[PDB]
Design a protein around this ligand. Structure first.
Ligand SMILES: *[C@H]1O[C@H](CO)[C@@H](O)[C@H](O)[C@H]1NC(C)=O
Ligand SMILES: [Zn+2]
Length: 1014
C-alpha cells in the first residue's frame, strides 16, 4: 500500500503550484482572443511525416436543461438518433460519437426489431461509437463520487447488455470545470483515455504554450502514478465548430455548413460558410488546413482531433448531408494534394486516441504528468462559474438524501433473492435511473429552467418512494420468523421516518406514533445501519403523549428524553419570527445501537405518567415581550427571559457559548481548556448595478458581503440530558445548534423568500492562523488544498463544498461537514464561509434565459468539528492534499448516511425479531461498503452479489483505536462458490480470488468484488 500522506508526488504540472505562479492576465490575443497568434513551420510536415486529421461528428444532448428530458427527446433527440441511424447506415465512411445513454436507451427500446439490428451493426462496425457511456455526462463539482459511479454503471450496464460494448474513452465537454474524481473512477472502470473542455482560459493558454494539453492525470496523493489516465484538454473557448477547427473562429465558422441560412443560423463573425465546389475547394482547403496546422502546434503528436458538432446537432437529414458532402469534398482535395502533407477523414474518439498512442509508442512524443483539479472555471474575463455550486440548493440537498436511500434500498434487499412479483428490481432500477439522471450537468447544478427543475424533483420524489417500498419490504422479511412471513408486495409494513428531509418547517410529512390506553399501548420501530461497523446514534420519533418509554426486544429499558415539537412561524401580525409548541405531539429521543449493515428493533410504550427511564427537557424562550407557550401534557413549563448570552454542555462533550442573538461564540473542548473563539455570522452578497449580472451559473458579487441586520431575534433554548439545542429565528434563516455530546450539528431552515438579488452566506470567524490556505473536498472523495489568491476576484476564490471544508494552523483545526453540496471559501485567515441560497432576478447569458426566482425553504445540515491537531501526523507543506480526522470523518458519515428509521404500521407485528446482522464483521472505521448490490434475478442458478469497497485515509493523531474484524464481503452471503475482483461497474472480471476471500483495500483506494453463490 502506497503512503498517501508522507511522499509528495513528483509531477510536471501540479495545479495549485501552477495557480501560484500564473498571472491570469486577460489580454486580447487576436483572433484567438484568449491565446496568441500561432505560427508554425510549414516544413514540419512532409511526405514522410504527415498530419493525420480526425474530424469527429458529435451532438451535445442535454437530459433536460431548457426543456425536460422527455420534451427534448420528442422534439430533438429521437430525430437526431433516427437520422444518425439512417445516415450512418447509408454512408459507410461517416462516423458519429454518442455520450448520453439515458437518451440512447429510451430511443433503442422504441425501435422496431429491424432497426435495432441496423443500430447494433453500425455500432459493431465502428461507425457509431459511445464515449464514456454514462446515463449522463455529469456535473463534476457538486456530484458525489458515489452517484458519479452509479450513473456510469447504469449506462455501461445497459450498453454491455444491449450493444455488447464498454467504452474505454470518456468525453466530457460541458461540465463547468473538471474534477480528478473522474479519472479516478474511470481508470478503475477500465478506461484508457478521457477528454475535457471547460477549464479556465488562463489555464488553457498556459498549458498550450508548453504543449501540456495532453497529460497523464494522476491523483494528488499518488506517488507511484498507478492512478494515471491519459487526458486530452481541448484548447479553445467552446466545443462548437467555430472553436474547434483552429484558433480563428471567423474562419472556422465558415466550415460549419449548417450556418448558410435555411437552418436559421449564421456566423457572428460576418463571413458565412460557402458550399464547397471544384472552383473553390483549393482556396477553402488552404484556409482550413492552415487552421488545422495552427491547432496542431499546441500538441505533441502528428495526430489531430477536430470535433465537429454543437448542441443538439445532426437533427435533420439535410443537416447530415450538408456537413458530410462538403467535408468529403475537402478531404478528397486535401488528401490528394501532397503539398499539404495531410491525411484527413471522419473518425471516432477512440480512433483518435489509438493513433495518438501509436505515435507515442513510435517514440515521437512523451507526455507530461499532472495532478490537481480544474476549478473554479471562468470562460471569459472575471465571469467565474461558482454560482452553480449553490443554485437550487433544495435539490442539491435532495440529491444527498436520495443518494443514501438508493444505497440503503439496494443493500437491504440484496440480502435475499426476490420473486419477480415483488417488483424489487423494477423499483430499484427506476430509483437508480432518476438519481442518475439528476447527476446531469444541468441537474444537480441548479442550471435548468424552472419547469425542468420541477421535473427532476418529481422524478426524485418517485425514486424516494420506490426506495422506501423496497426498504420496508426488506425489513419486514429480515426481521420476521420465516415460517410466519406472509408478504403482500404492495402493502406498507413500515413507514420510513426521516427527521431531516424534507425537514421540520419544510414539510409536515412525518407521521406521529399514536398511542393511547383506548387505542394502542405500544409500537415497534426499527433502525437500519448501512455502514459496516457497529454504530450508536440518537434517533427521534414523534409520539402522541410525553409519557413514553423505550425498551429493546429483550425488554431492557433504554434511557430516553422527551422534548416538545417546536415550529417557527413568521408572524405577519407581530412582525416577528417565534416558535410555537405542539400541545398534542412530542419528540422522543433515545440512543439506538445497530449492527454493521444491520437492523435493531425497539418498542415505545405509553404510560399513564412519567416513566422511570424517560427524562424531559427544560425549555427557555428568550425575547422581550414574551407570551405564554402551553405544551399540553408536557410535564415541564416553558421558562422566559430577556435575550442574554448562554452556555451549554451535553454529556462530557464540549461546552458551547452563544451570544444573546443565539449564535455560537466559543467552543471549550474540555473542562480545563480555553473557550476557543468560534463565531457564526450571517451575511449577504448583492449583484452589480452595472456590468455583468450574477445568475444560475455566475457569482458576480458587488463587493464583500454585508452583515444581515438581525434586529432582536427570538432565541429558544432546549436543555436535555441526551440533547440540547439553541435555535434562533433570523431573517431568512432559523439557525439551530444541536448538541448530543460531541461535535454539534448545525441546521439552517433557509427561506430567502422574496429578497431579490441576494445571496445568503454563513460564515465562521476564528483566530486560527490559516493565512491564505484552506481545504475543500472533491466529490466527497478527497480533500484538496486550496490557496486564496488575492490576484483573483472574490468569486474565483469560491470552490465547491460537496461535503466538507476546513482550515487549520499548527495547533488547531476547524472542520465544517455538510449534508449537501454548496459553494464556499475562506476569504480571510481564520475564516470559513458557505453560501446557503441565492435569488437572482437576471439571466447571466449562458443560455438559461431566466434568473433564479424559484427558491423554496430548505433545511441545510452540518456538523462543526473544532479539534487540536498538533499531534497529528500531517502531509508536509508542499503536499497538495489534506485528510480528515476520525471524528470529522464519522461526523460526515452521520450527515450522509444516518441510521434509517422505520415505524411498524399495523397494531401488531407477529413473528417480530429484535436484530439482524449481529454477526456481521465490524470493519475498521476508515473502510466503507459504498455499494452492496445483488446483480442477478431469482431465476439465475448462480446468484451474484456486487460490492464496492472504499477506504478513506484518516490522520494518525495518537489515538490507539484498536480491535476490529477483517471484512470479507465475499463471505457476507452463504454458499459462496467464487469471488472475483472486478471493475467498479462490475462489468469486467479482473481477478479470480484465492480462498474466495476479498481482501480489504488500501487507504484512498476503491475496489469492487462480486461473489457467486450456488
Ligand atoms: C460482442 O462481444 C464480443 C466482442 O468483444 C464478441 O465476441 C461477441 O460475439 C459479441 N457478444 C455477443 C453477441 O455475445
Ligand atoms: Zn450540456
Amino acid at each position: 500500500c502506497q503512503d498517501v500522506v508522507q511522499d509528495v508526488p513528483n509531477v510536471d504540472v501540479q495545479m495549485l503550484e501552477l495557480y501560484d505562479r500564473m498571472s491570469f492576465k486577460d489580454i486580447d490575443g487576436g483572433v484567438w482572443k484568449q491565446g496568441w497568434n500561432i505560427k508554425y513551420d510549414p516544413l514540419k510536415y512532409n511526405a514522410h511525416h504527415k498530419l493525420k486529421v480526425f474530424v469527429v461528428p458529435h451532438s451535445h444532448n442535454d437530459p433536460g436543461w431548457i426543456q425536460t428530458f422527455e420534451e427534448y427527446y420528442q422534439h430533438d433527440t429521437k430525430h437526431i438518433l433516427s437520422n444518425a441511424l439512417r445516415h450512418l447506415h447509408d454512408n459507410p465512411e461517416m462516423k458519429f460519437i454518442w455520450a448520453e445513454i439515458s437518451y440512447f436507451a429510451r430511443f433503442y427500446h422504441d425501435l422496431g426489431e429491424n432497426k435495432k439490428l441496423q443500430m447494433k451493426s453500425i455500432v459493431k462496425n465502428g461507425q457509431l461509437e459511445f464515449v464514456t457511456g454514462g446515463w449522463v455526462m455529469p456535473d463534476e463539482a457538486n456530484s458525489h463520487w458515489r452517484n458519479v459511479l452509479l450513473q456510469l454503471t447504469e449506462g455501461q450496464t445497459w450498453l454491455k447488455q444491449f450493444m455488447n460494448v464498454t467504452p474505454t474513452a470518456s468525453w466530457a465537454i460541458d461540465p463547468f470545470g473538471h474534477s480528478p474524481t473522474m479519472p479516478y473512477i474511470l481508470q478503475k472502470s477500465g478506461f484508457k483515455n478521457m477528454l475535457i473542455q471547460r477549464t479556465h482560459y488562463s489555464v488553457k493558454k498556459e498549458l498550450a504554450q508548453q504543449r501540456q494539453l495532453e497529460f497523464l492525470w494522476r491523483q494528488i496523493w499518488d506517488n507511484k502514478g498507478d492512478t494515471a489516465l491519459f487526458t486530452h484538454m481541448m484548447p479553445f473557448y467552446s466545443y462548437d465548430i467555430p472553436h474547434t477547427c483552429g484558433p480563428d473562429p471567423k474562419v472556422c465558422c465558415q466550415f460549419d455548413f449548417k450556418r448558410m441560412g435555411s437552418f436559421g443560423l449564421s456566423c457572428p463573425w460576418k463571413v458565412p460558410p460557402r458550399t464547397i465546389s471544384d472552383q473553390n475547394v483549393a482556396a477553402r482547403s488552404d484556409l482550413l488546413v492552415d487552421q488545422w496546422k495552427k491547432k496542431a502546434e499546441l500538441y505533441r503528436t502528428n495526430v489531430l482531433l477536430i470535433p465537429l458538432g454543437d448542441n443538439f446537432r445532426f437533427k435533420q437529414n439535410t443537416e447530415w448531408d450538408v456537413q458530410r458532402v462538403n467535408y468529403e469534398r475537402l478531404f478528397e482535395h486535401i488528401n490528394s494534394q501532397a503539398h499539404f502533407n495531410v491525411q484527413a477523414q471522419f473518425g471516432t474518439l477512440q480512433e483518435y486516441f489509438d493513433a495518438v498512442h501509436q505515435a507515442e509508442r513510435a517514440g515521437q512524443a512523451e507526455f507530461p504528468t499532472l495532478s490537481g483539479d480544474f476549478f473554479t472555471y471562468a470562460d471569459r474575463s472575471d465571469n467565474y462559474w461558482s454560482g452553480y455550486y449553490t443554485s437550487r440548493p433544495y435539490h442539491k440537498r435532495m440529491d444527498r438524501v436520495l443518494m443514501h436511500y438508493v444505497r440503503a434500498a439496494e443493500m437491504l434487499s440484496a440480502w435475499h433473492s426476490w420473486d419477480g412479483m415483488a417488483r424489487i428490481e423494477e423499483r430499484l432500477e427506476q430509483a437508480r435511473r432518476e438519481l442518475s439522471l439528476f447527476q446531469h450537468h444541468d441537474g444537480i447544478t441548479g442550471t435548468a429552467k424552472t419547469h425542468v427543475v420541477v421535473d427532476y424533483e418529481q422524478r426524485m420524489q418517485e425514486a424516494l418512494k420506490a426506495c422506501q417500498m423496497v426498504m420496508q419490504q426488506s425489513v419486514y422479511r429480515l426481521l420476521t420468523k420465516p415460517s410466519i412471513y406472509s408478504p403482500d408486495f404492495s402493502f406498507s409494513y413500515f413507514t420510513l421516518d426521516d427527521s431531516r428531509w424534507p425537514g421540520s418547517g419544510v414539510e409536515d410529512s412525518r407521521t406521529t406514533i399514536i398511542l393511547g390506553e383506548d387505542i394502542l399501548p405500544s409500537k415497534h420501530v426499527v433502525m437500519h445501519n448501512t455502514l459496516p461497523h457497529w454504530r450508536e446514534q440518537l434517533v427521534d420519533f414523534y409520539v402522541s403523549s410525553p409519557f413514553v418509554s423505550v425498551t429493546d426486544l429483550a425488554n431492557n429499558p433504554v434511557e430516553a428524553q422527551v422534548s416538545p415539537v417546536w415550529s417557527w412561524h413568521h408572524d405577519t401580525l407581530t412582525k416577528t419570527i417565534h416558535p410555537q409548541g405542539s400541545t398534542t405531539k412530542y419528540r422522543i429521543i433515545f440512543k439506538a445501537r445497530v449492527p454493521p449493515m444491520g437492523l435493531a428493533t425497539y418498542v415505545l410504550t405509553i404510560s399513564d405518567s412519567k416513566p422511570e427511564h424517560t427524562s424531559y427537557a427544560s425549555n427557555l424562550l428568550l425575547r422581550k415581550n414574551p407570551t405564554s407557550l402551553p405544551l399540553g401534557q408536557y410535564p415541564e413549563d416553558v421558562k422566559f427571559g430577556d435575550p442574554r448570552e448562554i452556555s451549554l454542555r451535553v454529556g462530557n462533550g464540549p461546552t458551547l457559548a452563544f451570544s444573546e442573538q443565539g449564535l455560537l461564540k466559543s467552543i471549550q473542548l474540555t473542562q480545563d481548556s480555553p473557550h476557543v473563539p468560534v463565531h457564526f455570522k450571517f451575511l449577504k452578497y448583492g449583484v452589480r448595478s452595472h456590468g455583468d449580472r450574477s445568475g444560475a451559473y455566475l457569482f458576480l458579487p458587488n463587493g464583500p458581503a454585508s452583515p444581515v441586520e438581525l434586529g432582536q431575534p427570538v432565541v429558544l433554548v432546549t436543555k436535555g440530558k441526551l440533547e440540547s439545542s439553541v435555535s434562533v429565528g433570523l431573517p431568512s434563516v432559523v439557525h439551530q445548534t444541536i448538541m448530543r455530546g460531541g461535535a454539534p450539528e448545525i441546521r439552517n431552515l433557509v427561506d430567502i423568500g422574496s429578497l431579490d438579488n441576494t445571496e445568503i452566506v454563513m460564515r465562521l470567524e476564528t483566530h486560527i492562523d490559516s493565512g491564505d490556505i484552506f481545504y475543500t473536498d472533491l466529490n466527497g472523495l478527497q480533500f484538496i488544498k486550496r490557496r486564496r489568491l488575492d490576484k483573483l476576484p472574490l468569486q474565483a476564490n469560491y470552490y465547491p463544498i460537496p461535503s466538507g471544508m476546513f482550515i487549520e494552523d499548527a495547533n488547531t483545526r476547524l472542520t465544517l461537514l455538510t449534508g449537501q453540496p454548496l459553494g464556499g471559501s475562506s476569504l480571510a485567515s481564520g475564516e470559513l464561509e458557505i453560501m446557503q441560497d441565492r435569488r437572482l432576478a437576471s439571466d447571466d447569458e449562458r443560455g438559461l434565459g431566466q434568473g433564479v426566482l424559484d427558491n423554496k425553504p430548505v433545511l441545510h445540515i452540518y456538523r462543526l468539528v473544532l479539534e487540536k491537531v498538533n499531534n497529528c501526523v500531517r502531509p508536509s507543506k508542499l503536499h497538495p492534499a489534506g485528510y480528515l480526522t476520525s471524528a470529522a470523518h464519522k461526523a460526515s458519515q452521520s450527515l450522509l448516511d444516518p441510521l434509517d428509521k422505520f415505524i411498524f404500521a399495523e397494531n401488531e407485528w407477529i413473528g417480530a425479531q429484535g436484530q439482524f446482522g449481529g454477526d456481521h464483521p465490524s470493519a475498521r472505521e476508515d473502510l466503507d461498503v459504498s455499494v452492496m448490490r445483488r446483480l442477478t434475478k431469482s431465476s439465475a442458478k448462480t446468484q451474484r452479489v456486487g460490492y464496492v469497497l472504499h477506504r478513506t485515509n484518516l490522520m494518525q493523531c495518537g489515538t490507539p483505536e484498536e480491535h476490529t474484524q477483517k471484512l470479507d464481503v465475499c463471505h457476507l452471503l452463504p454458499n459462496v462458490a467464487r469471488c472475483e475482483r472486478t471493475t467498479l461497474t462490475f462489468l469486467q472480471n479482473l481477478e479470480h480470488l484465492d480462498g474466495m476471500v476479498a481482501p480489504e483495500v488500501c487507504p484512498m483506494e476503491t475496489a469492487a468484488y462480486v461473489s457467486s453463490h450456488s
